[PDB]
Design an enzyme around this catalytic site. Structure first.
Site, PDB file in Angstrom:
ATOM      1  CG  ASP A 298      -0.207  -0.045   2.552  1.00  0.00           C
ATOM      2  OD1 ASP A 298       1.025  -0.266   2.645  1.00  0.00           O
ATOM      3  OD2 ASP A 298      -0.866   0.155   3.595  1.00  0.00           O
TER       4      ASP A 298
ATOM      5  NE  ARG B 287      -1.783   3.430   3.985  1.00  0.00           N
ATOM      6  CZ  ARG B 287      -2.874   2.743   3.669  1.00  0.00           C
ATOM      7  NH1 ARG B 287      -3.340   2.652   2.429  1.00  0.00           N
ATOM      8  NH2 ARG B 287      -3.570   2.103   4.601  1.00  0.00           N
TER       9      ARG B 287
ATOM     10  CB  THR C 250      -2.286  -4.178   1.431  1.00  0.00           C
ATOM     11  OG1 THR C 250      -1.313  -3.250   1.957  1.00  0.00           O
ATOM     12  CG2 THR C 250      -2.807  -3.642   0.119  1.00  0.00           C
TER      13      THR C 250
ATOM     14  NE  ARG D 145       1.909   7.334   5.084  1.00  0.00           N
ATOM     15  CZ  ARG D 145       1.527   6.178   5.621  1.00  0.00           C
ATOM     16  NH1 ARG D 145       2.385   5.169   5.659  1.00  0.00           N
ATOM     17  NH2 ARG D 145       0.307   6.037   6.101  1.00  0.00           N
TER      18      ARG D 145
END
Length: 136
Positions: free
Chosen positions: A16, A30, A36, A82
């Site tokens: 992910d 991300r 996941t 992210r």
């Protein structure tokens, strides 16, 4: 509406997370709306189907002709810095492919970063019906 922008693969990190060169800058991304199983789980380490989810994302982005990122309508970065986005490999959304394969669950959703939520939920329902991977 949302728009796709070009990016260049630097490195796949997990199912992910992927590091991309975006507008000339290395950035960690991300994948929006999916969880996941992880290989780098903080408390757990390597969960079941973690290596599988991680190899899938890696192959998909490493073997692409083109990678594109698509930000949603809300915040574009999380608290770790992210980028928050849908990632496309040759026009195919990686986020949805994981969910269609039973290698990810649709995550808890935070409006207004929910534009593709219904579509992902449909693929998730189909992977459960087909009892794929995580749903087996």
């Amino acid at each position: 509406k949302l728009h796709k922008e070009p990016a260049t693969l630097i490195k796949a990190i997990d199912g992910d997370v992927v590091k991309l060169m975006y507008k000339g800058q290395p950035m960690t991304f991300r994948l929006l709306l999916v969880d996941t199983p992880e290989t780098k789980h903080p408390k757990k380490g390597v969960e079941k189907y973690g290596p599988e989810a991680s190899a899938f994302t890696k192959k998909m982005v490493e073997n692409a002709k083109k990678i594109e990122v698509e930000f949603d309508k809300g915040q574009r970065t999380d608290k770790y810095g992210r980028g928050l986005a849908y990632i496309y490999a040759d026009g195919k959304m990686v986020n949805e492919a994981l969910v269609r394969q039973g290698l990810a669950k649709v995550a808890y959703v935070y409006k207004p970063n929910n534009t593709h939520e219904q579509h992902l939920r449909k693929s998730e329902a189909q992977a459960k019906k087909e009892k794929l991977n995580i749903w087996s």
